[PDB]
Every structure is written in C-alpha cells, then in structure tokens.
Short mmCIF file of C-alpha atoms in Angstrom, two decimals:
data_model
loop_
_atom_site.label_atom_id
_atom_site.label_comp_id
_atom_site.label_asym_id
_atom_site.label_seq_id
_atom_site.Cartn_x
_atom_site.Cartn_y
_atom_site.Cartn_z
CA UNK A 1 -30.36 -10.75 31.15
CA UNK A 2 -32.44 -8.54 28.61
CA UNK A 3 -30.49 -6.12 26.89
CA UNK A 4 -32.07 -3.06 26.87
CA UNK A 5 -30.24 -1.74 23.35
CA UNK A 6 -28.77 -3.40 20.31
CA UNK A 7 -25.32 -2.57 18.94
CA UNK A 8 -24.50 -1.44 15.40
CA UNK A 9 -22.36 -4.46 14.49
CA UNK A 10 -20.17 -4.63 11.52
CA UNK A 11 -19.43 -8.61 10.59
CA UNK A 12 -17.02 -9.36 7.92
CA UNK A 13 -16.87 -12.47 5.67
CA UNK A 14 -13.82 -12.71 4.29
CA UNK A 15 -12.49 -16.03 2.12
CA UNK A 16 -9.30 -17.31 1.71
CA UNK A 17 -8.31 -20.10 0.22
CA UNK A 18 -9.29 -22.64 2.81
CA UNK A 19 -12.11 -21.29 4.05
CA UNK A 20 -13.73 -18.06 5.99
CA UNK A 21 -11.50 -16.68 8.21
CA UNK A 22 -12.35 -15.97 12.09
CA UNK A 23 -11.00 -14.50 15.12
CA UNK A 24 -10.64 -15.50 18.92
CA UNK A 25 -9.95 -13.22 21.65
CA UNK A 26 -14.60 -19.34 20.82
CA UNK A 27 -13.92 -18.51 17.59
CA UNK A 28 -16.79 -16.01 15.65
CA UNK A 29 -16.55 -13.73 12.35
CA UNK A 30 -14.57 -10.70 12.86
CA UNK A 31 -15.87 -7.08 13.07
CA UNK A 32 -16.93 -5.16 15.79
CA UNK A 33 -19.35 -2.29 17.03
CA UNK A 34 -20.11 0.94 15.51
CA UNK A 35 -19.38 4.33 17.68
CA UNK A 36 -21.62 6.75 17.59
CA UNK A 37 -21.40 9.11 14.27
CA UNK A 38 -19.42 6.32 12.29
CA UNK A 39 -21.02 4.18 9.49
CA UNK A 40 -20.88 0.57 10.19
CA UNK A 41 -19.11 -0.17 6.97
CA UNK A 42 -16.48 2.38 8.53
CA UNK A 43 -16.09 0.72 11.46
CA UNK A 44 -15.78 -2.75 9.87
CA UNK A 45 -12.43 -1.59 7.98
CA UNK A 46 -10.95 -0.31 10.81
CA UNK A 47 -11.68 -3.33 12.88
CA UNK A 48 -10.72 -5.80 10.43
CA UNK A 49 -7.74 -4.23 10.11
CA UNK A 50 -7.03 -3.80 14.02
CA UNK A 51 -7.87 -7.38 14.85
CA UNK A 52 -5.63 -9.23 11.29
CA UNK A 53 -3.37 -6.76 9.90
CA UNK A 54 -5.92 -6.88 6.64
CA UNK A 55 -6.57 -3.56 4.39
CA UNK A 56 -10.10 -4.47 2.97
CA UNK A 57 -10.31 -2.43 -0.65
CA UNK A 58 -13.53 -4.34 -1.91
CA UNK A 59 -16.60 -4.80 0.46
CA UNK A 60 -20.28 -6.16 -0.31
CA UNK A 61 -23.11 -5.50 1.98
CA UNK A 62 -25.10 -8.77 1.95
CA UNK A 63 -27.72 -9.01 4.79
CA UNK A 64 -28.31 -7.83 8.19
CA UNK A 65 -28.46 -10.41 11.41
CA UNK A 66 -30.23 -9.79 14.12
CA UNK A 67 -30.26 -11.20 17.83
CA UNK A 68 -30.91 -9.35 21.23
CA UNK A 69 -27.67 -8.22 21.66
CA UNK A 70 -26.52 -7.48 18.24
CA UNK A 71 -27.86 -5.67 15.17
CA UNK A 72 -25.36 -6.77 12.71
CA UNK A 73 -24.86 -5.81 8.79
CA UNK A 74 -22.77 -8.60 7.31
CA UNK A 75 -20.24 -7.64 4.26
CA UNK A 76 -18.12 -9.90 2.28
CA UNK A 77 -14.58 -8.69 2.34
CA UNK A 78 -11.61 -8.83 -0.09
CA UNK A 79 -8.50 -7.47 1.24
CA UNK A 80 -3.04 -9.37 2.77
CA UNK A 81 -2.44 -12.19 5.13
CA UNK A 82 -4.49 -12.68 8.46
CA UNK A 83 -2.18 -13.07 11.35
CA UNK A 84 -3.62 -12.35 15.32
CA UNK A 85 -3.70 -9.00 16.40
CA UNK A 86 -4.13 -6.80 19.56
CA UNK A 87 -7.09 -8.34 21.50
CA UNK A 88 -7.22 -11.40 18.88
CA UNK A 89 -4.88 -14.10 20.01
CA UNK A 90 -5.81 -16.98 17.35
CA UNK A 91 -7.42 -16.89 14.03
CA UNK A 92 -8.64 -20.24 11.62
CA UNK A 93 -10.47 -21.04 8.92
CA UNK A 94 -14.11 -22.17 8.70
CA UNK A 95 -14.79 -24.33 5.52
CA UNK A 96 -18.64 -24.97 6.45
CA UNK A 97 -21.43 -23.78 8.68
CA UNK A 98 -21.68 -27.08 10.69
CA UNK A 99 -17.19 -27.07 10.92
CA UNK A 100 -16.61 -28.69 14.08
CA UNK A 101 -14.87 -25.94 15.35
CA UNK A 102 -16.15 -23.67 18.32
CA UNK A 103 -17.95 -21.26 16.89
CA UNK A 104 -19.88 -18.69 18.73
CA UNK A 105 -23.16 -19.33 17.73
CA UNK A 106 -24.29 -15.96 15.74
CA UNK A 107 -21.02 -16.68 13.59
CA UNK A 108 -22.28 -20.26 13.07
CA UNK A 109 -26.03 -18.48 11.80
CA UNK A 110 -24.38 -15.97 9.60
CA UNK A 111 -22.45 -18.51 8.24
CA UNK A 112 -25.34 -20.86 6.97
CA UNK A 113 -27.32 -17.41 5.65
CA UNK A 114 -24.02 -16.78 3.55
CA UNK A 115 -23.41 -20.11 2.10
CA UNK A 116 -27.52 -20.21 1.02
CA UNK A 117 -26.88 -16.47 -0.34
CA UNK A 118 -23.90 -17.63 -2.26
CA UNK A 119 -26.16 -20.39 -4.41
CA UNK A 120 -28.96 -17.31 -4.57
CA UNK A 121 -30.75 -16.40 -8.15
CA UNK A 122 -30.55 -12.67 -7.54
CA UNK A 123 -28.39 -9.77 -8.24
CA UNK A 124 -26.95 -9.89 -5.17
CA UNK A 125 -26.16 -13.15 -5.21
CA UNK A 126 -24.58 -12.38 -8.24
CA UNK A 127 -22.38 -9.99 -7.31
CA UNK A 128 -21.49 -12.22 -4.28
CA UNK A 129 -20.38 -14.62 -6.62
CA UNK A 130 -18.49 -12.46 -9.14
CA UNK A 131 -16.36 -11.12 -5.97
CA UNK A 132 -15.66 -14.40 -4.97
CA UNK A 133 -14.73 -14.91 -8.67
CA UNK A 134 -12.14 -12.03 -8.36
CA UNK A 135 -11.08 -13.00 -4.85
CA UNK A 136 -10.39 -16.63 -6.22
CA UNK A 137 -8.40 -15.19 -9.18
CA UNK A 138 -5.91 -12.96 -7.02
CA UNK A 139 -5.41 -15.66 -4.99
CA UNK A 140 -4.66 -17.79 -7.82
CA UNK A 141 -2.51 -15.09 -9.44
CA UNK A 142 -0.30 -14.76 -5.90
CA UNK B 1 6.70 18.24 -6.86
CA UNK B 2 6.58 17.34 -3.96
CA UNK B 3 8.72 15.18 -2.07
CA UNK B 4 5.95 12.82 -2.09
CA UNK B 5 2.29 11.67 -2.96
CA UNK B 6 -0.01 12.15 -1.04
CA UNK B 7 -3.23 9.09 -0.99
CA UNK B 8 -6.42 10.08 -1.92
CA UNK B 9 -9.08 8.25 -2.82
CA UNK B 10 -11.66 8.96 -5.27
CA UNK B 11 -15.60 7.14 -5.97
CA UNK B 12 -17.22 6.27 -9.22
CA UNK B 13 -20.95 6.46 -8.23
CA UNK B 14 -23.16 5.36 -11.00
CA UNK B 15 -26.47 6.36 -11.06
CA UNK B 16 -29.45 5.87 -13.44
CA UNK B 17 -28.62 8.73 -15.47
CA UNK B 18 -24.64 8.65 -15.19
CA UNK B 19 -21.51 8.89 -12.82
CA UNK B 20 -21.87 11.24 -10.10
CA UNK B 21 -19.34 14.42 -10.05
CA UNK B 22 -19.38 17.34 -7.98
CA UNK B 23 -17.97 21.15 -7.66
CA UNK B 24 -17.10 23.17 -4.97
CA UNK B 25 -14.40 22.53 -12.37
CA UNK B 26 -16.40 19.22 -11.58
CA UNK B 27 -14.72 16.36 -10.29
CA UNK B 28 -15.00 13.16 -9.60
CA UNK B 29 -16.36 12.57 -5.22
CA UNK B 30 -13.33 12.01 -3.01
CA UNK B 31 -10.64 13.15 -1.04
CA UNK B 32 -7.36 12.79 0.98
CA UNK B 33 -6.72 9.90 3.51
CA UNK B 34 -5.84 10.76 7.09
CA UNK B 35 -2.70 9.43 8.51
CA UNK B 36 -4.02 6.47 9.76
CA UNK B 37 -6.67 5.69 7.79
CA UNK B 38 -6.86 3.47 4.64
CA UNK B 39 -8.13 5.17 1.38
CA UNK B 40 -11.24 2.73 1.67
CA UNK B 41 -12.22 4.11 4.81
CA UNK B 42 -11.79 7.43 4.00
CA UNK B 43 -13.49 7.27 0.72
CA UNK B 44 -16.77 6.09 2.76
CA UNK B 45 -15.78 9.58 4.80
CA UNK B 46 -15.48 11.86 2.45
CA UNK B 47 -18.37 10.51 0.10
CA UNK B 48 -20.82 11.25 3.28
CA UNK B 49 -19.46 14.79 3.67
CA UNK B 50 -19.90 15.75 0.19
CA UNK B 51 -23.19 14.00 -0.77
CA UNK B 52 -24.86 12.53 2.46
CA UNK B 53 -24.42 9.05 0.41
CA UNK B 54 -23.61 6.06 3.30
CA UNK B 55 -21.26 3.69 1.65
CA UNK B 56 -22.52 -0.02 1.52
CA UNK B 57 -20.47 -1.44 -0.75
CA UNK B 58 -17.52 -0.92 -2.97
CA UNK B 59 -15.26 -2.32 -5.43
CA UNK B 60 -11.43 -1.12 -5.78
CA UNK B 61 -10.59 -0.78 -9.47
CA UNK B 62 -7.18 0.55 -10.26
CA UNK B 63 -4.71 3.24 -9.16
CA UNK B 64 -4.39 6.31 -10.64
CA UNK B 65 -1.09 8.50 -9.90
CA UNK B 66 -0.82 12.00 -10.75
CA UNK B 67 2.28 14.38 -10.16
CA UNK B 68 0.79 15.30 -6.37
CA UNK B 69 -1.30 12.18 -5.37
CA UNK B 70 -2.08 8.76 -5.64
CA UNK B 71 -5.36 7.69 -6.46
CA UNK B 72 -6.90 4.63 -5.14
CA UNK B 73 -10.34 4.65 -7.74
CA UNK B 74 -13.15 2.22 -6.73
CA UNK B 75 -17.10 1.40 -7.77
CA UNK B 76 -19.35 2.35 -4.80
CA UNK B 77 -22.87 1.48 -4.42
CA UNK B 78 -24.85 3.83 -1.67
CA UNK B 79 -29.02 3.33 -1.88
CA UNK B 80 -30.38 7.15 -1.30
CA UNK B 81 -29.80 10.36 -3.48
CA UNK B 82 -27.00 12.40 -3.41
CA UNK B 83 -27.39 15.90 -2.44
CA UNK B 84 -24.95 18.89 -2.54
CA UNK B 85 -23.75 19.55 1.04
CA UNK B 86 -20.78 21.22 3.17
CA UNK B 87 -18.27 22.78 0.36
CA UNK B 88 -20.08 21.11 -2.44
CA UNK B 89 -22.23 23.21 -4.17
CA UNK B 90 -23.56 21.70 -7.73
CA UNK B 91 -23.60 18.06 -8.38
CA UNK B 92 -24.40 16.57 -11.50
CA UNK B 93 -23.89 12.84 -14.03
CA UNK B 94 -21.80 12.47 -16.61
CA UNK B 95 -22.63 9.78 -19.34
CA UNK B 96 -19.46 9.61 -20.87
CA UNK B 97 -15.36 10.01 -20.21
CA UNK B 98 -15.94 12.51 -23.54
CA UNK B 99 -18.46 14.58 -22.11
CA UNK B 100 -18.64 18.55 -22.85
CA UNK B 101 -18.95 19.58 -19.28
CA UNK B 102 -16.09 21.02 -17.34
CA UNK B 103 -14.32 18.20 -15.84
CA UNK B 104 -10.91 18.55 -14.16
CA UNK B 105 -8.45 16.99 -16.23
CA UNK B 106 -7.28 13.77 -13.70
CA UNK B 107 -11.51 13.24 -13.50
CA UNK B 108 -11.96 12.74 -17.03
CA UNK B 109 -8.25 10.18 -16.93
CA UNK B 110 -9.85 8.16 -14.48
CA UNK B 111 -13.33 7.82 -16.21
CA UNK B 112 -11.63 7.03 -19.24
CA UNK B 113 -10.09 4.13 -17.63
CA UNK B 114 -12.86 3.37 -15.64
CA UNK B 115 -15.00 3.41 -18.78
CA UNK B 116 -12.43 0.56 -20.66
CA UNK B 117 -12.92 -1.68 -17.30
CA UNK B 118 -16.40 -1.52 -17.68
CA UNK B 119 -15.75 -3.81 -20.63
CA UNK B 120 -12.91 -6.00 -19.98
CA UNK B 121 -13.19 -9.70 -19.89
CA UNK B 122 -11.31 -10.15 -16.83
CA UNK B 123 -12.56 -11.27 -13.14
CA UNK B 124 -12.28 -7.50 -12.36
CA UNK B 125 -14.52 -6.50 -15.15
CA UNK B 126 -17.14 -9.81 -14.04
CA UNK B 127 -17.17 -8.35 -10.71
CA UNK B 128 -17.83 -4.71 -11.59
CA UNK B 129 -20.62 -5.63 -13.86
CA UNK B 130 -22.24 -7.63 -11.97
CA UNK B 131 -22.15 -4.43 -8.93
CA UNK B 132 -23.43 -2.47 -11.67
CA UNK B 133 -26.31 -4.98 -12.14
CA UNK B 134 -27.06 -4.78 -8.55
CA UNK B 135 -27.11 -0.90 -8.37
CA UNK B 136 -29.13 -1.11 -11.31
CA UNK B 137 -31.72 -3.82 -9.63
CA UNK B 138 -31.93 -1.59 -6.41
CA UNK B 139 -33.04 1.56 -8.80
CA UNK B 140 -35.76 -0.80 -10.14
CA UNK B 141 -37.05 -1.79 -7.07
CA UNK B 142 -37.25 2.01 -5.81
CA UNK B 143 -38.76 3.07 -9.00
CA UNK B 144 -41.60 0.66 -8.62
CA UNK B 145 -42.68 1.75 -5.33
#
C-alpha cells in the first residue's frame, strides 16, 4: 500500500568496537519516530536510550534518507554498553553494508551512504571522522 | 547548600562573530534537566525555548560543578539565527572568556575552559575543531547565497 504521510524518523549510527550496533524487536539501525512538537534529534536520545540503556552526549547530523514510509535524519552517536531493552529483544553488530546479517533493507542503504560519507573530502566528513577519532580513543582508554 | 546538585546543562553556540549568551547578567544558553531526561536532551529543549535554535548536532566537552549544580557543557551546532524569545530578552556574542560585558561568574568559568579545549591536542580537542570547521563551512555556504 501507498502511504499517504512520511514519518519524522530519527536513525542513529552508533560504533563500537566491532562494528555499528543494531536493534531487533530483522535487525535495522535504532531510532524511532518523532511526536508531534519534538525535534527529531530529541526523539533520537530518548529512543536510543529506551531501546539499549545508552545516554548519547555527542551526536552528528549527517544526512537525511528518504523512502515512502520514512523521512529519516541519520546522526552518528557517541554515548555505555548496549544491552536489549523494552520492545528490543536482540541487538549485534554490523561491520559492513553487505554483513550477511538480516538487515532491514533501509538500515542496509543508510549503512552504505555512511561508510561512503566516512571516506568524504568535506567538512562534514571531517567531523565524522574526528568523532570517530574520539569514539575510538574512549574506547581505547576503557 | 543543598543536599544535592541539581543537572543542568549548558550550550556553547559559536557563531561568526562569537559564542552566543543570553539575559533574561548574561549567561551562557541552558537550563535544568527534568527528572527523566538526560542533560543532552534537555539542552536541545531548553536551547529551542530560549533562542528558537533546533539542535542538530552536539559535542559534550567537560563537566562543570558549582556549589548548586552540575554542569554538563557541550559544542552545539544549530543552522538558523538565534533570536530572543520566551524569558530571554537580549542576546548577544562574546569573543573572549575575558570579555568586558556582564557575564555571570560560572559563564565566564566555563568559557575559560572551553576556550583552553579549543586548543588542546587531544581527540577531544580534534573533534571540536573539526565541528567548529563545519559550523564555520555552513556560515560560508549561507553567506554566499
């Protein structure tokens, strides 16, 4: 069927060590749906932190995805350790866009946009990869 | 004192011309969490109410405890113009953590701090540059148009 609207979707990429992390309530990047009056970066916290048990304290807007159901904005997140949650029963790590895991297949799209967006000559790839310096270092540091 | 601190969180906004304060003394944009609610989420709250910024993108810097409240302090990047709304009534930039204007006291701490991170050669110091760079390639683009 057609859908008639397109949510406000808030999609987080968030690295550990091994990989991107995602969710299963197939497996797809977490986030979730705006509500009316909230930001989608607001709604992205609290999700993230509803579905994993993550606090995210760094976020970087990096593109917006669109589909017909979903109008996402995609954010690298640094924030803990993931562990299932509420509706999410099991969570993995993706360590490439073409993983032979299940992956829904927006998640899988994102996925490919961030690892081009990563290698980018821009500022935002830039920043991108200075988080992922800083990510890399607390991780190292724990 | 209090029996405890209470979590607030406060935004360095740079833009072209300097970091954004604001006065309802001027301060640095923020404000208290909710119960429930992570500082991060309710600085992107509170920097909406006070200068109709939306909150793409920040960076968490440091802490910043004072005898009342505990500061979480982070680098936001928003892409409009801020404008003085609800209880804030004059807005303005400051260029430097030894300005003359009239900043509260735990303000001008946290810039001063904020303005030796700026520098550092650490991976927190890469990353906040290189948000800074961003901002600052955003403000070209607009500019040009």
């Amino acid at each position: 069927r057609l859908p008639s609207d397109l949510a406000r979707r808030a999609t987080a990429i968030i690295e550990m060590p091994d990989g991107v992390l995602v969710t299963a309530s197939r497996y797809n990047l977490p986030g979730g749906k705006a509500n009316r009056g909230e930001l989608r970066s607001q709604a992205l916290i609290r999700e993230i932190r509803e579905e994993t048990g993550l606090r995210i304290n760094s976020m970087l807007y990096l593109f917006d995805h669109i589909t017909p159901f979903n109008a996402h904005k995609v954010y690298l997140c640094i924030a803990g350790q993931p562990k299932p949650q509420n509706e999410i029963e099991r969570i993995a790590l993706v360590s490439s866009p073409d993983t032979d895991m299940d992956l829904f297949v927006e998640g899988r799209a994102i996925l490919r946009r961030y690892a081009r967006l990563r290698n980018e000559e821009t500022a935002k790839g830039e920043a991108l990869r200075a988080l992922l310096g800083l990510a890399r270092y607390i991780a190292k540091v724990d």
